[PDB]
């Protein structure tokens, strides 16, 4: 019972990609709270809520070890449409390179495709919630109420 | 015979502690995400 | 038996304190970098 | 004949008392060493 | 026979009370001596 | 969106000049580190910044 009150999961920034007519890829940064024992990314599920659609996701069998490289939106983004994808940004004692275990101090990004999972688009002036429930910790809450104008090919959302 | 002093108090206070903590953790996300939008809007 | 007074209050208030502080630290950079450009533009 | 009232209750309650005490002593070190690191981290 | 109700609960809760108090006393000096330097620096 | 990391080249230029003219040829996926001030030489090796560098 101490492990349930101790652990957690902290969202610290959400970006999105655009470039045809509307947003179709989301990138979520992520980091564990500084009391968590061992967050295991093989069993964490993301819910999203939009347009009368409540969508539950699961882990997808593709990842990358991009610690040193660049161009986050240009490597291995073709195994989507029912799952999310995991990228590693920082790992000292290489405990997350295999079998998805985050210790105290990593940085892991998530990539979700929207066009092939909602069957459509995500226009402006909307409001979407959602949760990133771990196995036993406390969830981080999502809110990315969209801006009223799209200008560049890479827009910030949170 | 009377050495069941843990079953009376320990498990019950652990569960009540978890409940009273889970109130305070879950009551803060609503107000932080309501107060964060207000300044930058 | 009833000496679990730290698990009720201490860890929960430390986490709520960190959350309520991280709101106030992260809400200031947007307004300082919006107010710094305004004068010299 | 019936003066064996100590063998029924005394030794058994001493052992159950030692067990129920050794639970409460050994269950506190984990939570104190988990709560001490949390504040100063 | 069953009048050993003090050995079960009393000594164990006194020791657990001393441990749970010694956590709270010793966890405050670090944060007070970290917070006192911060303002006057 | 470009993520960088630490690069295996640095310098101890505390006293010299011409920042854009020394050891700028180990780039293209990382950044490079120069030291401008360090009293108790705690950042000369293994990159630890104390209070006041």
């Amino acid at each position: 019972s101490t492990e349930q009150v101790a652990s957690g999961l902290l969202i610290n920034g959400i970006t999105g990609s655009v470039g045809t007519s509307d947003v179709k890829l989301l990138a979520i940064y992520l980091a564990p709270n500084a009391g968590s024992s061992a967050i295991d990314l093989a069993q964490t599920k993301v819910m999203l809520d939009y347009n009368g659609k409540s969508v539950v996701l699961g882990y997808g069998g593709n990842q990358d070890m991009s610690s040193g490289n660049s161009s986050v939106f240009s490597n291995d983004t073709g195994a989507t449409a029912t799952t999310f994808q995991v990228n590693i940004l920082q790992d000292y004692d290489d405990s997350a390179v295999d079998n998805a275990v985050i210790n105290k101090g990593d940085a892991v990004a998530l990539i979700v495709d929207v066009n092939a999972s909602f069957a459509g688009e995500i226009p402006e002036r909307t409001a979407i919630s959602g949760k990133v429930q771990p196995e036993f910790g406390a969830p981080g809450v999502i809110s990315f109420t969209t801006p009223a104008s799209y200008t560049t090919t890479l827009v910030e959302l949170q | 015979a009377s050495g069941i002093g843990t079953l009376i108090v320990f498990i019950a206070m652990v569960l009540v502690a978890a409940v009273a903590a889970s109130v305070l953790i879950n009551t803060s996300g609503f107000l932080q995400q309501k107060a964060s939008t207000t300044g930058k809007e």
Side-chain angles (χ1 to χ4, degrees), chain B residues 21-39:
Chain B
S22 296
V23 172
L24 291 172
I25 275 93
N26 290 116
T27 190
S28 179
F30 180 76
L31 58 90
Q32 66 166 351
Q33 292 178 355
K34 188 171 177 65
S36 179
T37 63
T38 304

Side-chain angles (χ1 to χ4, degrees), chain A residues 90-139:
Chain A
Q90 181 180 1
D91 194 2
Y92 175 70
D93 56 353
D94 66 7
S95 65
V97 177
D98 193 74
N99 69 23
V101 174
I102 296 173
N103 54 7
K104 295 179 183 179
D106 290 336
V108 168
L110 300 178
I111 292 173
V112 179
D113 189 77
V114 178
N115 193 2
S117 181
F118 286 171
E121 68 270 15
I122 175 174
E124 64 188 3
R125 293 180 184 270
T126 62
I128 295 171
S129 67
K131 290 182 181 180
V132 201
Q133 283 84 2
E135 179 68 28
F136 60 93

Side-chain angles (χ1 to χ4, degrees), chain A:
Chain A
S1 178
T2 309
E3 297 292 328
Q4 184 175 2
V5 68
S7 296
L9 201 281
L10 185 64
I11 301 298
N12 55 2
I14 294 169
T15 63
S17 177
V18 74
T20 62
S21 180
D22 193 81
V23 177
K24 64 181 179 68
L25 276 79
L26 291 175
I28 299 169
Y29 293 99
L30 190 147
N33 194 2
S36 66
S37 296
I39 300 300
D40 188 75
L41 287 177
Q43 290 173 357
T44 63
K45 292 185 180 293
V46 176
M47 275 85 84
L48 292 176
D49 290 328
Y50 179 70
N51 199 359
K53 293 181 181 179
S54 180
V55 173
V56 177
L57 296 175
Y59 182 74
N62 193 0
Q63 60 90 29
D64 196 359
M65 56 180 288
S66 175
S67 67
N69 288 318
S70 172
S71 70
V72 179
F73 292 104
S74 178
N75 283 318
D76 286 331
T77 179
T80 60
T82 188
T83 54
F84 61 93
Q85 293 177 355
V86 173
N87 289 322
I88 300 168
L89 295 176
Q90 181 180 1
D91 194 2
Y92 175 70
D93 56 353
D94 66 7
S95 65
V97 177
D98 193 74
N99 69 23
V101 174
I102 296 173
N103 54 7
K104 295 179 183 179
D106 290 336
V108 168
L110 300 178
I111 292 173
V112 179
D113 189 77
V114 178
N115 193 2
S117 181
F118 286 171
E121 68 270 15
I122 175 174
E124 64 188 3
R125 293 180 184 270
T126 62
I128 295 171
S129 67
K131 290 182 181 180
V132 201
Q133 283 84 2
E135 179 68 28
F136 60 93
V141 186
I142 300 172
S143 179
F144 59 105
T145 299
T146 58
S149 294
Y150 296 99
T151 60
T152 62
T153 59
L154 194 278
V155 62
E156 292 290 327
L157 280 77
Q158 181 178 0

